[PDB]
Write a protein that binds this DNA or RNA. Sequence first.
RNA 1: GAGCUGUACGUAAGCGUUGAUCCAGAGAUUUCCGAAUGGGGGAACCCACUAUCUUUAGUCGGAUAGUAUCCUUACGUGAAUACAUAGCGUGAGGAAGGCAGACCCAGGGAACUGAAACAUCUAAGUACCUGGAGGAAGAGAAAGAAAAAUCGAUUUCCUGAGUAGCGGCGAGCGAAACGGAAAGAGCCCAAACCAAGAAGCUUGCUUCUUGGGGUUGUAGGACACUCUAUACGGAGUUACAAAAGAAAGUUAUAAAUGAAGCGGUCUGGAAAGGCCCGCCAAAGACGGUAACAGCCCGGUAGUUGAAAUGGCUUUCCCUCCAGAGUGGAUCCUGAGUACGACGGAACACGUGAAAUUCCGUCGGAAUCCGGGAGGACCAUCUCCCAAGGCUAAAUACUCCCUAGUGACCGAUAGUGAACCAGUACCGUGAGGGAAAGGUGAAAAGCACCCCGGAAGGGGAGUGAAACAGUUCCUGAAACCGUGUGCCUA
RNA 2: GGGUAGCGGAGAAAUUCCAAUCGAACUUGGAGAUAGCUGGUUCUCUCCGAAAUAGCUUUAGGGCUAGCCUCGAGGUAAAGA
RNA 3: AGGUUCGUGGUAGGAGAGCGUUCUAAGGGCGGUGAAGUCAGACCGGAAGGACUGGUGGAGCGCUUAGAAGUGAGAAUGCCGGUAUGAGUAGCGAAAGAAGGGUGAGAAUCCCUUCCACCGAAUAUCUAAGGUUUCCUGAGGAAGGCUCGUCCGCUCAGGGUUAGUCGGGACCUAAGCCGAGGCCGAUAGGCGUAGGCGAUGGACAACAGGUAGAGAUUCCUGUACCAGUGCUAAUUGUUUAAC
RNA 4: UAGGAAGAGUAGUACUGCCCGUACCGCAAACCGACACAGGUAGAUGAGGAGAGAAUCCUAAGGUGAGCGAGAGAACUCUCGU
RNA 5: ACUCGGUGAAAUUAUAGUACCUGUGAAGAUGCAGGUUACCCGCGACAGGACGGAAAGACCCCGUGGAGCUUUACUGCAACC
Lengths: 102, 59
Amino acid sequence: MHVKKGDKVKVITGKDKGKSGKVLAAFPKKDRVLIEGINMVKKHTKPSNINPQGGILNVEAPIHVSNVMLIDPKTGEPTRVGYEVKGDKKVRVAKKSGEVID
Amino acid sequence: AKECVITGRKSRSGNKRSHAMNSSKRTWKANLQKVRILVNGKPKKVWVSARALKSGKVE
RNA sequence: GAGCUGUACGUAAGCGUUGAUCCAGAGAUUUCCGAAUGGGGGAACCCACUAUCUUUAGUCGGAUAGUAUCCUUACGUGAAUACAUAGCGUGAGGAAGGCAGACCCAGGGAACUGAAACAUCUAAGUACCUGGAGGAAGAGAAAGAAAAAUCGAUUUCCUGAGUAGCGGCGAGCGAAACGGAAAGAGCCCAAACCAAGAAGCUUGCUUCUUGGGGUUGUAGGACACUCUAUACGGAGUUACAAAAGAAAGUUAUAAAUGAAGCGGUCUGGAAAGGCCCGCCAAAGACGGUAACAGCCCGGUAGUUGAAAUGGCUUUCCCUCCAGAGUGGAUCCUGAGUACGACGGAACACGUGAAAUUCCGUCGGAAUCCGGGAGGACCAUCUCCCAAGGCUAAAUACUCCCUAGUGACCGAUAGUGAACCAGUACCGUGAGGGAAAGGUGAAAAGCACCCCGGAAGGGGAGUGAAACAGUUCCUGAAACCGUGUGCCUA
RNA sequence: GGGUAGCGGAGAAAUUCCAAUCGAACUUGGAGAUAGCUGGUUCUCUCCGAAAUAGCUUUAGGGCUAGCCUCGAGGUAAAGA
RNA sequence: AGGUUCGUGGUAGGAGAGCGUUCUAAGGGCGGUGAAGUCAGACCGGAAGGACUGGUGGAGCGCUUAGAAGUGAGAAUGCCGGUAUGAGUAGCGAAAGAAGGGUGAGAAUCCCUUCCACCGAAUAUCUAAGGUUUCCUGAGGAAGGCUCGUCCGCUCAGGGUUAGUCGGGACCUAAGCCGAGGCCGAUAGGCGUAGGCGAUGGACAACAGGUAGAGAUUCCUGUACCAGUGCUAAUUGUUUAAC
RNA sequence: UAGGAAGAGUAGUACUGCCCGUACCGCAAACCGACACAGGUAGAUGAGGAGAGAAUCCUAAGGUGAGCGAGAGAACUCUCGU
RNA sequence: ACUCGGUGAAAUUAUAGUACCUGUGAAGAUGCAGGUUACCCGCGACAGGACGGAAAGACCCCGUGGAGCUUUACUGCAACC
Ligand SMILES: [Mg+2]
Ligand SMILES: [Mg+2]
Ligand SMILES: [Mg+2]
Ligand SMILES: [Mg+2]
Ligand SMILES: [Mg+2]
Ligand SMILES: [Mg+2]
Ligand SMILES: [Mg+2]
Ligand SMILES: [Mg+2]
Ligand SMILES: [Mg+2]
Ligand SMILES: [Mg+2]
Ligand SMILES: [Mg+2]
Ligand SMILES: [Mg+2]
Ligand SMILES: [Mg+2]
Ligand SMILES: [Mg+2]
Ligand SMILES: [Mg+2]
Ligand SMILES: [Mg+2]
Ligand SMILES: [Mg+2]
Ligand SMILES: [Mg+2]
Ligand SMILES: [Mg+2]
Ligand SMILES: [Mg+2]
Ligand SMILES: [Mg+2]
Ligand SMILES: [Mg+2]
Ligand SMILES: [Mg+2]
Ligand SMILES: [Mg+2]
Ligand SMILES: [Mg+2]
Ligand SMILES: [Mg+2]
Ligand SMILES: [Mg+2]
Ligand SMILES: [Mg+2]
Ligand SMILES: [Mg+2]
Ligand SMILES: [Mg+2]
Ligand SMILES: [Mg+2]
Ligand SMILES: [Mg+2]
Ligand SMILES: [Mg+2]
Ligand SMILES: [Mg+2]
Ligand SMILES: [Mg+2]
Ligand SMILES: [Mg+2]
Ligand SMILES: [Mg+2]
Ligand SMILES: [Mg+2]
Ligand SMILES: [Mg+2]
Ligand SMILES: [Mg+2]
Ligand SMILES: [Mg+2]
Ligand SMILES: [Mg+2]
Ligand SMILES: [Mg+2]
Ligand SMILES: [Mg+2]
Ligand SMILES: [Mg+2]
Ligand SMILES: [Mg+2]
Ligand SMILES: [Mg+2]
Ligand SMILES: [Mg+2]
Ligand SMILES: [Mg+2]
Ligand SMILES: [Mg+2]
Ligand SMILES: [Mg+2]
Ligand SMILES: [Mg+2]
Ligand SMILES: [Mg+2]
Ligand SMILES: [Mg+2]
Ligand SMILES: [Mg+2]
Ligand SMILES: [Mg+2]
Ligand SMILES: [Mg+2]
Ligand SMILES: [Mg+2]
Ligand SMILES: [Mg+2]
Ligand SMILES: [Mg+2]
Ligand SMILES: [Mg+2]
Ligand SMILES: [Mg+2]
Ligand SMILES: [Mg+2]
Ligand SMILES: [Mg+2]
Ligand SMILES: [Mg+2]
Ligand SMILES: [Mg+2]
Ligand SMILES: [Mg+2]
Ligand SMILES: [Mg+2]
Ligand SMILES: [Mg+2]
Ligand SMILES: [Mg+2]
Ligand SMILES: [Mg+2]
Ligand SMILES: [Mg+2]
Ligand SMILES: [Mg+2]
Ligand SMILES: [Mg+2]
Ligand SMILES: [Mg+2]
Ligand SMILES: [Mg+2]
Ligand SMILES: [Mg+2]
Ligand SMILES: [Mg+2]
Ligand SMILES: [Mg+2]
Ligand SMILES: [Mg+2]
Ligand SMILES: [Mg+2]
Ligand SMILES: [Mg+2]
Ligand SMILES: [Mg+2]
Ligand SMILES: [Mg+2]
Ligand SMILES: [Mg+2]
Ligand SMILES: [Mg+2]
Ligand SMILES: [Mg+2]
Ligand SMILES: [Mg+2]
C-alpha cells in the first residue's frame, strides 16, 4: 500500500476527521490500517484465559487506507507521494515540499 | 478380408426392384475363387477374382 | 519491497530489509489404476522369472534393470524332404489409446410424417452406427466451357431463377453456362532411348535393379545435327529435392513511471451531495472508499522495461541446378483399359427420344493415315488428348486463451447448476435428476443483573437503526389470533 | 456359480413369463412425430353487425365456391323500396 | 368552430381511438430536509386508469417527444410454492403385569429387588450371505423414536478387530468365460486350437484352559504337530558310480 | 524307468515360516420389503414327563413381558362359549 | 366403538345464514313460484338425497386413429427348385 507500518497518519474523512496517529498494523489483503487512538470500539468480552476478568474493553478498529494521508516529517502537512530512485534504493518523496520522507 | 488380393474388389450394396418399383436393399458380390499363387517367393492360397485371372497371374 | 505460514476463525510453534510470503520464464521430483504392456484380476489388487548387488550362521528379507502383442527389417538356427522353405530365436525401428456433443471424407442406412387413404414418390442420403483424418478437409492445371467469338486450373459469394426441366405430370423436387466479385501458381512421373551391374540361360539373347533423359495437341518427345551453358547466373524445405546452423529486428509470457482540492461552509452516523471558490487534462475509462469523486486510493493517457523461453520477419550460411534452334527415315505417348450387353446407383433428370459419371458380372478396341466430346444417332465442322501422381490462397467450425461489446437475464429469470451440482435423491443397470443468494460501513455478534434444567425472555450496553440479534434488506395475500363501536336466540 | 435378449428368448400351452411394466421389455435419440378431435388463449371504450342455406366432395360434427357482414374507392340517360 | 336532421340492445365477426408495463435516445427534472416498493384514506377522469396526504422503508426514480417489445390472466382434471377444510376426528402395527427402593428440574415408560406371566424342533445356541462401525466407554437430550424419556441401533469425543495350523491366495480342476497363430465376414466383428482363468467340489500341520469395557483354535499359560535352515557328533559314498 | 549326480542321509540342538478376513447384527429394530413394517431369508445343534414321533400339552438350559396409557362395561361390527 | 390424559393424518372442497309439499323449468329442485311448518349451539347413532366420492365409460357410435391375428384381398421379401 502507500502507507507503511510505523508511519504518521492524518485522517482525512470519517468521524475522526482531522486527527493524527501512528500505524500499528497494516492489512494489505483487505486494504485496512490500524491507527492508534482512532476509531475506538467497545467489546463485550466474557471472562477467559486471556482477559481474566472480562468486561467492556475499549480498543481500536481498522479503517480504510483511502481515508489516510502521509504527514511530511518536516513540513508537517498531508502530501501525495512520488517515488524517486536515489542511489541504490527507491525512496518515497513528498510531492509538495519536494523532499524525501524516508 | 473377403476380397481380391489383386485389384481388391468386394461386395457393394444397391437396390432390388420389382414391377411397381418397390425398392429393397441387396448386395453385389465379386466371384472370388480360392487359388494358390506366389504372393512372395512362396505360394499360398488367397482370394482372387475371376476377372484378374484371365491374363497375368500364375496358378 | 514489508509483512507471512490458503479456504478459515482460533490456538500453538515459527519465519522475514543478510530481503520472506507473492508474480513470470526455465529445471528437478512426480505413489497406485487406467491403451496398461512380466502373468492373473471382481479398478486403484494379487503372484512372479532372469541378471548384478546387499543382509543373516543360514533359510527368511532387501535394491536396481529387463521381461506383452502385432507389422517392417537384419542376422542366426531349422521339419516332413536331398537342396530348400515353413517354423523357432535375437536385435533395430513403428503401431496401439483418448477426445471439441463442432467442422469433412468414406462404408452402411430408417421410420414417423406429406401426398388430406395409400404402394411409385416424399421425409432423406436426413437421424443413427462404423472407419480415416487435418488444422482445415475436399476439388484442382481441360480427352473442359462454348458456337458467325472466343475463353483459358480449382474453390467460395451475387445473379441467372423458382427460370429450363423432372414428376401416380399428383404432393412436390429443381439446375448449369454466360455476366459481376474474393483469391490467385503451377508442376513431377510411365514409355522411347543412353550407361552400369545381376539373374535366367528366352543359350549370345530377354528381364531385373540403379543412374541419366522426358512429359505434350499450333501435337510433343526419343533420334540427328548446330549455338550457348557445369555455377556466370538461378532456385529452395507451403507443391515444384532435402537436412542443418548463425546474426539483427519485432512480438508474447512478470513490471516501472505517471498531472491536478486534506478548499470553505450546510445537512448528516458518515459527504463523493447542496451552496461558494480553485486547478489538471495526449489523463472526464472502470472500480473502490461510511451517500452520487477528473483532483482520496488502485489506476487511466503518454512514455519506458526482459535474465529466461516461445513465435514471426529479414540477412548470411547451407543445399540443389543445363536451355535455345533447325529437321521429319524409324521409334514412344498409361490394356483386360476405353467401350458394349445385363442388373443397379449418381447426375435437378423417377428409363425416358437419355447424352454424362460410378459399381458387380460377362464380352472386349484403335494406337498420330490415332483417339474423345459438343444431351439418342449419322455426316461436316469446332474444341480437346482419358485409362499415373502432387499442389498454397480465397471457404467451414470453436473445447480453448487474450482484449472487448450488447434499446441480452436478473435468483420460478439467465446454464440443469450465481450457494462444495451432474451433487443430494431414485433405479439391478443403461439412465433420470433437484432445492438452496442479501446482518451491519465496521463484529463494534449483546460485559453485567433477573426468571428458567435448558430453550426462550425482561432490562442494561453497541450501533444511524436490534421492530438490523448469526433463514439477519424490504416484508404483499391466503391463513391463525387478541381487543373492541353497531347488530343478532 | 453359470447360459439363452426384444424383427429376440423361454413355455407339461394360460397370449404364460422375461426386475410390482408384456397381443410384443426398459432407456436415450429421430422428436416440438401426427391429432379434419377436446380443453385453454390475459387491458378499455366508440360505430356497424351475421349464419345455422345451395352446389360438389372417401363427403356428412371437415373443406371449397356462391349467398348473408364489415372497411375503402368509383360511375351515372338514378338505376333501390 | 357553430348549427339542422336522423340515430346510439347485441353473440361470431369487421373498422376506429386509446390506457397501462419493461428498455433506448434527446431534452428537462426529483431525491438522506428521504427514491422505488409496501400499508391506509370520505380525491380526480367517460373507461382502461391517475394524483395528493400520512405510516413503514433506506437508495435510486419520474416527466415530455419519439423508438423497440419475453406487453396486461380467473379458469387449461395447467406447473411450482405457501396455507386452509374435513378435526382435536381416523390411527398410534398381534402379546401380562404389579409393588417397593434409587436417580433426576421432571418418571406408567431409565436402573435395582421381589412376585407373577410367555416361548422352549424356539421366541434358545452357532454360522454362511448381505450390511458396513450399527461394537465399547464417557458425556447429551434440539431433531429421530407413532406417547414419555433422565433412555436408545439417535448426537458428540475418544477407543476397539493380533493366526505356520481357522476360511481364502501363493495348490487342483467342473459348468462357463477369455483366447497367440487360425477359419469366417460391408465396417464393427463372430467362432475357435495351443494356453489360461473360474467353487458351489478335491488335497492340506493345534489342542485344553484363563482372560470383568470392547478380540481369541489369533493374546497368555501348559503340552504339540507341519515344512525348512544353520551348527555340532558319529556313519557312509565317489564316476561300473551312495543318493 | 529315461535322466541328474559327489556328496548324502542319521542323531541332537537352536533358529525361520508371507498376503487377505477376523469388531458387531445375522428368523432380524442392523439383511430383502420406501418404515424400529403380523411378509421372505441356505446350513449345524436342538433336553425331560407322557408318547411311534422333531405330533400334542406342561416344563429345563437359555431367552422374553413387544415404544401409548386408565376406566366405563350402551347400540353396532369382529373373534369366541352355551 | 364410548369418557379422560398424550400424540395426531387423509380422500374432498365455486362462495353458503343449506326445511317440507304441490307445481315450474334442459321435461326428476336445499336455492325458482304458491302454500305449510320451523327459538339458538352441540353429543351418540342410521344411511333417503346432495343425479354423493374414486376412475376425461371398458358397452354403443364416430375418426379417410392404432395395434395383434387370418386368408384362394393387393403389392412385395426370405427361402427353396
Ligand atoms: Mg427410395
Ligand atoms: Mg470377377
Ligand atoms: Mg472370366
Ligand atoms: Mg513418489
Ligand atoms: Mg489391464
Ligand atoms: Mg494384463
Ligand atoms: Mg488385497
Ligand atoms: Mg539373497
Ligand atoms: Mg528363416
Ligand atoms: Mg533334410
Ligand atoms: Mg487416433
Ligand atoms: Mg481429432
Ligand atoms: Mg427407404
Ligand atoms: Mg431421397
Ligand atoms: Mg429427394
Ligand atoms: Mg465417427
Ligand atoms: Mg493434427
Ligand atoms: Mg485456410
Ligand atoms: Mg488436400
Ligand atoms: Mg492451366
Ligand atoms: Mg496435363
Ligand atoms: Mg491455353
Ligand atoms: Mg471472401
Ligand atoms: Mg528425373
Ligand atoms: Mg528439342
Ligand atoms: Mg475539507
Ligand atoms: Mg451530525
Ligand atoms: Mg462536497
Ligand atoms: Mg479515457
Ligand atoms: Mg468512477
Ligand atoms: Mg478532489
Ligand atoms: Mg495396347
Ligand atoms: Mg456421346
Ligand atoms: Mg451409353
Ligand atoms: Mg455444351
Ligand atoms: Mg473440348
Ligand atoms: Mg489432390
Ligand atoms: Mg426475491
Ligand atoms: Mg453483508
Ligand atoms: Mg453490508
Ligand atoms: Mg434456574
Ligand atoms: Mg439467555
Ligand atoms: Mg422494518
Ligand atoms: Mg432493517
Ligand atoms: Mg407482517
Ligand atoms: Mg400480513
Ligand atoms: Mg365485536
Ligand atoms: Mg419388441
Ligand atoms: Mg392353462
Ligand atoms: Mg397377461
Ligand atoms: Mg390509436
Ligand atoms: Mg399501472
Ligand atoms: Mg435522467
Ligand atoms: Mg402499494
Ligand atoms: Mg395500498
Ligand atoms: Mg388502500
Ligand atoms: Mg426507517
Ligand atoms: Mg415494428
Ligand atoms: Mg417485451
Ligand atoms: Mg416475460
Ligand atoms: Mg381474466
Ligand atoms: Mg393441462
Ligand atoms: Mg394445477
Ligand atoms: Mg418456498
Ligand atoms: Mg401446489
Ligand atoms: Mg392439510
Ligand atoms: Mg415401577
Ligand atoms: Mg452412525
Ligand atoms: Mg420423534
Ligand atoms: Mg402418535
Ligand atoms: Mg437428569
Ligand atoms: Mg451411542
Ligand atoms: Mg490360512
Ligand atoms: Mg496358481
Ligand atoms: Mg486343514
Ligand atoms: Mg537339523
Ligand atoms: Mg506376500
Ligand atoms: Mg497377513
Ligand atoms: Mg448372535
Ligand atoms: Mg400318542
Ligand atoms: Mg398352545
Ligand atoms: Mg428358565
Ligand atoms: Mg386429551
Ligand atoms: Mg384421539
Ligand atoms: Mg318457496
Ligand atoms: Mg344447531
Ligand atoms: Mg372422413
Ligand atoms: Mg394391443
